[PDB]
Amino acid sequence: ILKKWPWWPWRRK
C-alpha cells in the first residue's frame, strides 16, 4: 500500500 512517487517535502520519513 502507498506507492505514488514519494515527492512530499513535508514529512519525508
Swiss-Prot record:
Taxonomic superkingdom: Eukaryota
Q: How is it modified after translation?
A: Elastase might be responsible for its maturation.
Tissue distribution: Large granules of neutrophils.
* Cellular localisation: Secreted
Arginine amide: which positions carry it? Answer: R12
Task: Relate the protein's function as given in its record.
Answer: Potent microbicidal activity; active against S.aureus and E.coli.
Which family would the database say this protein is a member of? Belongs to the cathelicidin family.
Q: Which named protein is this?
A: Cathelicidin-4
Organism annotation: Bos taurus
Lineage at the top is: Eukaryota, Metazoa, Chordata, Craniata, Vertebrata
Q: Which residues of the full protein are shown?
A: 132 to 144 of 144
